[PDB]
Amino acid sequence: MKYFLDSAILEEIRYAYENWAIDGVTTNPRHIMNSGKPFLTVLDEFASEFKGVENFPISVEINPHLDNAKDMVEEGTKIAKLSSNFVIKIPCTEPGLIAAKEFEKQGISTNVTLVFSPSQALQPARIGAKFVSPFVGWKENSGDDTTQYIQDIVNIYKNYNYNTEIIVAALRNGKQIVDAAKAGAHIVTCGFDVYKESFQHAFTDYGLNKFRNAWDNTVTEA
Amino acid sequence: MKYFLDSAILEEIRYAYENWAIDGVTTNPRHIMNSGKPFLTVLDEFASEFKGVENFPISVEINPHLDNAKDMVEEGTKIAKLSSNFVIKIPCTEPGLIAAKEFEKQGISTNVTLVFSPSQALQPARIGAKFVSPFVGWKENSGDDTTQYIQDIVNIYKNYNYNTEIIVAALRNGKQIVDAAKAGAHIVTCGFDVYKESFQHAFTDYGLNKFRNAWDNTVTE
Amino acid sequence: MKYFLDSAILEEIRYAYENWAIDGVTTNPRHIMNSGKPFLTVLDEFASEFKGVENFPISVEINPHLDNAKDMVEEGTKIAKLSSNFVIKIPCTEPGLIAAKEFEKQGISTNVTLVFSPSQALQPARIGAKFVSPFVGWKENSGDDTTQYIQDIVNIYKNYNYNTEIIVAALRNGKQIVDAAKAGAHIVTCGFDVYKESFQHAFTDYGLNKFRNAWDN
Amino acid sequence: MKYFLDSAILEEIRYAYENWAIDGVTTNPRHIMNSGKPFLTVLDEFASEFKGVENFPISVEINPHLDNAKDMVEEGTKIAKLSSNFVIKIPCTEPGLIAAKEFEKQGISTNVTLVFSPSQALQPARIGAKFVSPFVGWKENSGDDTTQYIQDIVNIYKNYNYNTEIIVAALRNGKQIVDAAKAGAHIVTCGFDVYKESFQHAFTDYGLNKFRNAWDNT
Amino acid sequence: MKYFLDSAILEEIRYAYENWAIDGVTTNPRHIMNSGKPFLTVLDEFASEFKGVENFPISVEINPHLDNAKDMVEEGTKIAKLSSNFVIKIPCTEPGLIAAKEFEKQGISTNVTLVFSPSQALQPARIGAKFVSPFVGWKENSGDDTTQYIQDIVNIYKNYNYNTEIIVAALRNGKQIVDAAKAGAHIVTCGFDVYKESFQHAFTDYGLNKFRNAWDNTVTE
Amino acid sequence: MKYFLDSAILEEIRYAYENWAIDGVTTNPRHIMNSGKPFLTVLDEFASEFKGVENFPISVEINPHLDNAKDMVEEGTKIAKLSSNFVIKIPCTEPGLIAAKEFEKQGISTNVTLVFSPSQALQPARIGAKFVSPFVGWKENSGDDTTQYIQDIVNIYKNYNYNTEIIVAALRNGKQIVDAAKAGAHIVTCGFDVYKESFQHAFTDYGLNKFRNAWDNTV
Amino acid sequence: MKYFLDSAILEEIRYAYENWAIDGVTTNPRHIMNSGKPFLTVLDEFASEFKGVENFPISVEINPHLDNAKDMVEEGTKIAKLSSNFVIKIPCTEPGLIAAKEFEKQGISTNVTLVFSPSQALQPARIGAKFVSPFVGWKENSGDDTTQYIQDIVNIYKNYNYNTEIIVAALRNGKQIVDAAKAGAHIVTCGFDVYKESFQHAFTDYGLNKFRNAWDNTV
Amino acid sequence: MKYFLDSAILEEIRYAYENWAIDGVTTNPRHIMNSGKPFLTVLDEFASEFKGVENFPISVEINPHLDNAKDMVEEGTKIAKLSSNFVIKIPCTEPGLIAAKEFEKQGISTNVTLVFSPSQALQPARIGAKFVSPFVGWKENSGDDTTQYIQDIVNIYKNYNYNTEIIVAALRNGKQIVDAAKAGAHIVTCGFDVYKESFQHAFTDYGLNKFRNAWDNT
Amino acid sequence: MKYFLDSAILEEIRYAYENWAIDGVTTNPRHIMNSGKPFLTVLDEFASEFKGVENFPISVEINPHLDNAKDMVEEGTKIAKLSSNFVIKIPCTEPGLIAAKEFEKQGISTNVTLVFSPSQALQPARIGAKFVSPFVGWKENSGDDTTQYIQDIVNIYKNYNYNTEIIVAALRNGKQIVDAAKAGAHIVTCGFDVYKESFQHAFTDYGLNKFRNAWDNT
């Protein structure tokens, strides 16, 4: 089971890789923006940072204004050249899908994003996308429940033996990671702080204090 | 998992194949009618369109008036000759089944249609039909629930290791496609618009707009 | 349990009332458009058609461009004057809700529409809307399942004793009507043909033929 | 997999085999009676009709008056000689079981019938019966529910890897066939009319009419 | 069913009351801090803002350092005097509970907070607290599931006919509000933006645009 | 709804009453023993401690050697005289039940204990016992599951409108209290420490510390 | 909830009434036989034993050979005269039902027995029988499962507000009593030994011994 | 899959083997007592009765007074010598388990009995007992439900791939056998009469009569 | 399947190994304290006691004050040297995990403890810990239910084919052991008395007494 970091902050990515054994990285125009840096600079820093590393995907989203497959494929190919770690994040639209279909035919890995239902998830798999990214958070913000549709996607993918790997996305806490693990999603992608806190629990603190007292009442060096 | 187009409009079929990777095509006398064109011309256009393609079924339904296996087999064989992509759509009637039994014995692939229950679905499988097409929409229109009977058919087929492939039919939206995928149906057949919209979701639009704004506030070169 | 007609075609509405005992009517800018007639003409025809009847709601949607409660309330009040059967259909937006809150305070019945989740459904009830209209069809078209969220709304409303009545909307077949009946929704709203076919069943035809033979013997 | 015809009417059996691909036949003193013809004549007609067809069982029930295993085995052996397609239908009684145990030891296939519970179904399997026939209809007539006990039998058989094949019996409609298919029963046995109608549905008729109109407009 | 605002920002509280018909307000030392203002100033502004209004609770948390019921009761009484809308937020500790017991005996309403299990929720109810506040968010952050324990609390309270009202707390989205509504919780408390967004949905936007197009093709006036 | 203290330590009982609003007390020969005091002294201290208090049952178990109803009733009546708060704890045995039947006829409240199944729970209710005490802990120690049998008892009592109140007993933690609350048991009885800790949770500590930091940056 | 004794042994009935507060008695030709006495003697002993008692049914089964309603009604009326406690146990047959229908019209209480399915249970209720007795044990002996059909009967009776009271019959252990209590059956009928043992549990014995030790270490 | 006879009456055991294909035998001090014969005589008769037969376990319970593993192992070894069909029934006590552990190390098959919970069942499996015998009847007599704990044991054994075979014990009817079959218990052990009746059903009688009438109308 | 003893009392460990076939040992600073002996003496006694035994893990917890991976790894390596049976118990903290990651890279087995949720359990598995120890008791003391989160962990581990073995910890009775067995947890760790009593049941005692009477009458 794979943990990807949904961030564009290189220092977050460095720490995660070294200490958490993150299995890859996801970005989008919003995360790129909040990096403070320009797009091609972020990309360049990434290229260099992971020149060596062999099976470590970095999902990078093409200009969202694009409204036609031809242009989509052009701009994405440019980005692909920049590093073999890069995967092309692409919206689940009529052109988006057509473009992904082509990208994958040409052996360029894609990540279809802005998926919100199992029917939306099906087509990426049917065109042999390397990654599909179904969203939780935005739906929940509006009062929609997500647990069924995510489970459905996983079951469907397993049932029809599709290779496409599911990245559960827009996650905001540990419980949600667990939901996905229970569902059997291939991958999960979360902000730095989400993962950090998913490791920490008040009972651990409580436990340490119990044990510190006990140690302080033991002869610890005969 | 297989997506078939339930349409007779060649332009719809062309787009679907090129962009959606549809895995085949279903027709019926109503879709043939609404094509505007005559039957054997539709068939001819299809024959030529897919002369090349090897594993791409086109289900073509024999005249609904025919009321006897002998005639059914005659008329269907004629249609089969016209192209090796064609499969013979045949109603789930007493003669219909007998005809399919024979067609398949003679190595002509059939698609038993107008199936509405699992008991109706069983016999096609027992005769080694290549396809069975159970219906959702028409039942739902009259207030019947379909989800159990479809699931039952799939489970039955899997359980007794039949080769017959299930084409869930008379679908009208994405949710229903998903229901079938969850059930494990082999195939689904839908109109052009159904599939098109099954790929589109309001949250995607919402997402794009978020992202367009973000891009417009980033230095992209 | 109430059946409303989601149409703006007066002839459909006439037949429904006379033969199906429809309990009211829903409209929206799309149905108004497809009437062929202009808005205030449709409204006028309705006003006259039901001048007498006092217990028969007709939901009529204000201009969707409006982006402010003040204007919303103005335009809707105008429409309310035209007939006491009219209910003011209003989108579930921040201004939409504020407007409904006011309309209802002033004793003008509202129908909050374009509701797609239970959290969206809650606020209309909290503001004392006469009707809330959660949608099925558009969600299903995009692959979303609706059965839970509709059931949830009903349970929530019953549980907290809100008087707001649920109109399950964007329906397309009989099964879906039944889903709502099973859920306990107050109201359902459907096109003419949906209802017509929800009454008809192939086994009935089959049965008649059995019985015709028996009679003729 | 596995439709048997519960009839003694040879014309029904002929049609079924040729057109429905029935996988075998079950009979019973009641069906034999209502054939009109006498037992050994019915059997003879069957012997000739098939013998030579390889794996097509015809279940034929020994005299129900018999009350001792010794006699049961004698009379059944006689019937077995008449054709190797015949299987010996035998009631689930204390002697019945003892007889089946012996029949199967001697390589004569049996069908233990008048089974109404899973405990009754177990012993036939434990003695290596070729067929067990649990009943639905008669129980339902008296208000008993059957769906659990049938499911239980199937699960039990699968779970303990018994070769004995289940013939769900005393069926009266298509829904019930489906119940058994869902349960995973090996075999089902039904009257001619049951099967015939299990293939027909009012929506098909309705559909044909839609389609006839459409055809007439091209 | 009651919506409370979990904020100390007066402008948020004003808007909510006027437009959302919020039924009350919750605060805690963290929200007080992030107000920018000092505690007794925030309190004073509140007192004045709602001088008139009856049945509108404002939950205000006593100093968390306090480790003894005697002091707790002293400091809280002081706060209670400041306004009859105020409710005394109190941690679920051994002294916390003892203090609440006394406060309620003296007819001063309390809100027991930092409740994380049904056993913790029981004692406040057993002491006749006006409010108990069980937490969702912090638990979920550490990987704990909350839906059962919240449901349990509600069922328990209903089953033993306690008047104590449940305020589901540390909420972050609309789905979670719905979970609580389904559970039958009396009250929910959320930040401004949570509520705002719980009213908005991408399908509404999509719907408006459909309808705007339709209107633009209609002769209205 | 009701919390009883399963202890014979007076100081524990005092604190519980004053701070936790315990609704009553349960004892048994084991708790009496571990009090350190003699039986009739414990009882006397209780009598005096709660002379006033009107709705506060104290369950006190008769000698477990007794094997006949006649003697059981004699010894228990003696104990009942000592205080009107006292309830007579009695094992779920053939004589035990017969004795309870009589005690209740004579208007002396009983608590049938050492109940381990719903069939055992039924008869106390059928004889109009004031309390029945089904056990959790000892069963679980041997690997038996208890959740169904407790739920069953509650449902049965509610369904047939028995007055007898259920005291879930031999409890060891908060989760178990909650199980009983979910089941709808009338009463629960727990050791001092169980209740104390059932009120405390590591997330509360964590919360306080968050808030202490916030307070220290305010005002 | 009612416990009836399924016995014809008067000494069993005496003990049960005095100590267990049994709410009535059921009999059948097999129990009558194993009494050692003749039918009319058993009946006479019962009549006298409960001359006083007003609300205490004794179910007494007419000759099973009878094959016609007219005779059934005659013989049962004779038995009814003998005591107002008696209820007429009657098989669930075509004549059986017709007879019960008449008996009840004439205000003579009946108990329809040898009921094995809910459809069989329905008709007694539809004719206003005072008691219906569905059977568990004999079905289970042959491998049939009973839990559904009993639950179904209860739900059906409650749902359509029939007065007829359900006596779950041919019971053989405590678990089965509990099953019926869970189902909400009105009445249960069991042998002496069944009830006796339904009140005992090994953990109680274990508990007593723990407590005896504790008592022996207390002043 | 396996039916064992819980009896010490040799005539019952003979009939069962010959006609029911019983797969083995269980005994205990109570059944030995009710045989009428003395212990070592019963054992001797058994030894001789099955000298030949290869795979047919006979469970024989050591003196229940024993309170120590040393003695348990001594007395059981003595019994084992008497016949290789014998399995040593042993109570689920602290000494009981220790003894079984040793018996099995020494290649002597044991049957741990008086098991009433899954935790009790686990340790026998953990020490490689050939048989564990969980009880139904005595629990039910006191109002305890058994179906969960039995299912749990089976699932646990399957899940952790233990070889120990489960003998569901203290059974009294057919339904209970079925419960165990549904659960997937390896073995069941019942009195003669229980099994006998588990094969018979009122609907079979009813069926025979229908069929006798039909036969009588040739 | 695997029973570990959560104790530091050598005599308890000896008895358990010899009679219960315990599969290993867990300790923590509290158990070390309540041993009465000093830490490095306890460790030494263990080292010697199990010098031979090859597949027998002994979990030993490093100083809980440590607040950095570097120091953690240093102190743990020291302990590892002392015996190849020892596993390094480590709290589920940010440094704790980083340290475990390193320990395991260096081929030193770790046991991540003070795990209270599935998200906490995931990371140890993701870093290839040999053992994770999720806690039941302390949660239940505060009124939290644990059954789901334990089941979730097991299902998650199985589903993503992690080798890390789950030690359900802070158990206090037999029922809880069974819960874990039902869940499919790899390992369980319990105090001496818990296991002892998990083998004893009042019905066994009751059974013995029945049987003693019966034996005394032959």
Which residues, other chains included, contact B19 with Cβ-Cβ below 8 Å and sequence gap of 6+?
A94, A97, A98, A101
Which residues, other chains included, contact C73 with Cβ-Cβ below 8 Å and sequence gap of 6+?
C99, C102, C103
Look-up of token digits 């274990």: G206
Nearest to C197 among B141, B172, B202 (CB): B141
- Measure in Å the smallest separation between the Cα of H101 and chain F Cα atoms: 20
CA angle H192-H195-H201, nearest 5°? 130
Tell me if residue A89 is catalytic: yes
- CA–CA distance, A191 with A4 (Å, rounded to integer): 9
CA nearest D120 in H: which residue? Answer: H199
Which residues, other chains included, contact C32 with Cβ-Cβ below 8 Å and sequence gap of 6+?
C8, C39, C42, C61, E214, E218
Judged by DSSP in three states, I53 sits in: coil
Beta-bridged to residue A169, according to DSSP, are: A135
DSSP 8-state class, residue B189: E
**DSSP result, A18-44:** III----EE--HHHHHTTSS-HHHHHH
- CA–CA distance, G33 with A72 (Å, rounded to integer): 95
Residue type, B63: N
Nearest to I64 among A178, A182, A215 (CB): A215
Catalytic residues of I: 89
Q: What is the per-residue burial (b if ≥16 Cβ within 10 Å, else e) of E35-57?
A: bebebeebbeebeebbeeeeeeb
Which residues, other chains included, contact A110 with Cβ-Cβ below 8 Å and sequence gap of 6+?
A76, A87, A88, A89, A90, A99, A100, A103, A104, A129, A130, A131
- Measure in Å the smallest separation between the Cα of E134 and chain F Cα atoms: 11
Is F18 exposed, middle or buried, given 0-12, 13-18 or 19+ CB atoms closer than 10 A?
A: exposed
Can you give the residue ranges of every domain in chain C? 2-215
Residue type, B210: K
Q: After which residues is chain C broken (C to N over 2.5 A)?
A: none
Which residues, other chains included, contact H170 with Cβ-Cβ below 8 Å and sequence gap of 6+?
H135, H136, H137, H138
Three-state secondary structure of E55-119: CCCEEEECCCCCCCHHHHHHHHHHHHHHCCCEEEEEECCHHHHHHHHHHHHCCCCEEEEEECCHH
Q: What is the CATH number of domain C2-215?
A: 3.20.20.70
Chain D residues near residue G116 by CB distance under 8 angstroms:
142, 144
First to last CA, chain H: 41
Closest CA to A178 of F201, I111, I150, I145: I150
Tokens describing residue H204: 């079979």
Closest CA to H89 of H121, H113, H63: H113
Residue type, H1: M
**DSSP result, chain G:** -EEEEE---HHHHHHIIIII----EE--HHHHHTTSS-HHHHHHHHHHHTSS-SS--EEEEPPTT--SHHHHHHHHHHHHHH-TTEEEEEESSHHHHHHHHHHHHTT--EEEEEE-SHHHHHHHHHTT-SEEEEB-HHHHHTT---HHHHHHHHHHHHHTT--PEEEEEEE-SHHHHHHHHHHT-SEEEE-HHHHHHHT--HHHHHHHHHHHHHHTT--
DSSP 8-state class, residue D62: P
With touching defined as 3 or more inter-chain CB pairs under 8 Å, the answer for chains G and C is no
Q: Which helix (H) or strand (E) holds H182?
A: helix H174-183
CA dihedral angle for residue H179, residue H185, residue H187, residue H192, rounded to 10 degrees: -10
Q: Which bin fits C53, alpha (ψ -120 to 50), beta or left (φ > 0)? A: beta
Closest CA to I150 of I195, I172, I181, I112: I181
Neighbour subunits, H (≥3 Cβ pairs < 8 A): D, F, G, I
Residue I8 has phi, psi (to 5 degrees) of: -120, 10
Q: Which helix (H) or strand (E) holds C15?
A: helix C10-15
Collect contacts of D136-141 with beta carbons under 8 A, ≥24 apart: D136/D168, D136/D169, D136/D170, D136/D171, D136/D172, D136/D176, D137/D169, D137/D170, D137/D171, D137/D172, D138/D170, D138/H203, D138/H206, D138/H207, D139/H203
- Measure in Å the smallest separation between the Cα of B65 and chain A Cα atoms: 37
CB contact, 8 Å: B203 with chain E?
yes
- CA–CA distance, C113 with C111 (Å, rounded to integer): 6
Judged by DSSP in three states, H25 sits in: strand
Task: Tell me if B177 sits within 8 A of B190, measured CB to CB.
Answer: yes
Nearest to G204 among F33, F98, F116 (CB): F116
Chain A residues near residue B211 by CB distance under 8 angstroms:
28-30, 61, 64
| β pairing state of A110-115 and A86-91 | parallel
Tokens describing residue A145: 């429940």
Chain C residues near residue E181 by CB distance under 8 angstroms:
118, 122, 152, 156, 159-160
Closest CA to D61 of D150, D140, D169: D169
Number of other CB atoms surrounding residue E66 within 10 Å = 20
Q: From the CA atom positions of chain F, what is the Rg in Å?
A: 19
**DSSP result, F164-212:** PEEEEBS--SHHHHHHHHHHT-SEEEE-HHHHHHHT--HHHHHHHHHHH
Beta-bridged to residue A112, according to DSSP, are: A90, A132
Q: Which helix (H) or strand (E) holds E165?
A: strand E165-168
- Measure in Å the smallest separation between the Cα of D136 and chain G Cα atoms: 13
- Measure in Å the smallest separation between the Cα of I204 and chain G Cα atoms: 9
The CB-side HSE value for A46 (13 A sphere, CA atoms) comes to 31
CB contact, 8 Å: A158 with chain I?
no
Task: Tell me if E91 sits within 8 A of F204, measured CB to CB.
Answer: yes
- CA–CA distance, H216 with F42 (Å, rounded to integer): 86
Number of other CB atoms surrounding residue A105 within 10 Å = 10
- CA–CA distance, D165 with A78 (Å, rounded to integer): 65
**C-alpha distance from residue H186 to each of H25, H138, H165 (Å):** 14, 21, 6
Tokens describing residue A215: 């140690």
**C-alpha distance from residue E150 to each of E169, E185, H63 (Å):** 10, 8, 55
DSSP 8-state class, residue A16: I
| β pairing state of D165-168 and D187-190 | parallel
**DSSP result, C58-95:** EEEEPPTT--SHHHHHHHHHHHHHH-TTEEEEEESSHH
Which residues, other chains included, contact B116 with Cβ-Cβ below 8 Å and sequence gap of 6+?
B92, B134, B135, B138, B139, B149, D201, D203, D204
CB contact, 8 Å: G206 with chain I?
yes
CB within 8 Å: H214 and D98? no
Tokens describing residue C204: 């009935």
Tokens describing residue G213: 């030790």
Task: Tell me the resolution in Å.
Answer: 3.2
- CA–CA distance, D10 with D15 (Å, rounded to integer): 9
Nearest to F218 among E29, E115, E116 (CB): E29
| B2-216: CATH superfamily | Aldolase class I (3.20.20.70)
- CA–CA distance, G206 with C206 (Å, rounded to integer): 71
Report CA C35 to chain centroid distance, whole Å: 17
Closest CA to C29 of E203, E200, E217, E221: E217
Which of D206, D208, D209, D211 should be substituted to probe chain C, the one whose Cβ sees the most C Cβ atoms within 10 Å?
Answer: D206
CB contact, 8 Å: I206 with chain G?
yes
Which of C92, C173, C205 should be substituted to probe chain B, the one whose Cβ sees the most B Cβ atoms within 10 Å?
Answer: C173
Is B71 exposed, middle or buried, given 0-12, 13-18 or 19+ CB atoms closer than 10 A?
A: middle
Chain F residues near residue E29 by CB distance under 8 angstroms:
211-212, 214-215, 218
CB pairs under 8 A between B and C: 62
The CB-side HSE value for A105 (13 A sphere, CA atoms) comes to 12
CA angle D218-B141-B31, nearest 5°? 20
**DSSP result, A115-166:** E-SHHHHHHHHHTT-SEEEEB-HHHHHTT---HHHHHHHHHHHHHTT--PEE
CB pairs under 8 A between E and F: 107
Tokens describing residue D161: 């890897």
- CA–CA distance, A37 with B220 (Å, rounded to integer): 10
Residue ranges of alpha helices (H) inside I6-131 are 10-15, 29-33, 39-49, 69-82, 94-105, 118-126
CB contact, 8 Å: I170 with chain A?
no
Closest CA to G202 of D43, H137, E73: H137
- CA–CA distance, A46 with A42 (Å, rounded to integer): 6
Q: Which helix (H) or strand (E) holds B157?
A: helix B147-159
Residues 99-118 of D with CB under 8 A from G: 116-118
- Measure in Å the smallest separation between the Cα of E208 and chain F Cα atoms: 44
Q: Counting every residue, how long is chain A?
A: 222
Torsion sign (Cα): B23, B29, B33, B38: positive
DSSP 8-state class, residue F96: H
Is F110 exposed, middle or buried, given 0-12, 13-18 or 19+ CB atoms closer than 10 A?
A: buried
Beta-bridged to residue C215, according to DSSP, are: none
* Range list of β-strands (E), chain H: 2-6, 24-26, 58-61, 86-91, 110-115, 131-134, 165-168, 187-190
CB contact, 8 Å: A200 with chain E?
yes
DSSP 8-state class, residue F116: -
CA angle A137-A143-A148, nearest 5°? 70
Is C148 exposed, middle or buried, given 0-12, 13-18 or 19+ CB atoms closer than 10 A?
A: middle
Q: Which fold has domain D3-216?
A: TIM Barrel (3.20.20)
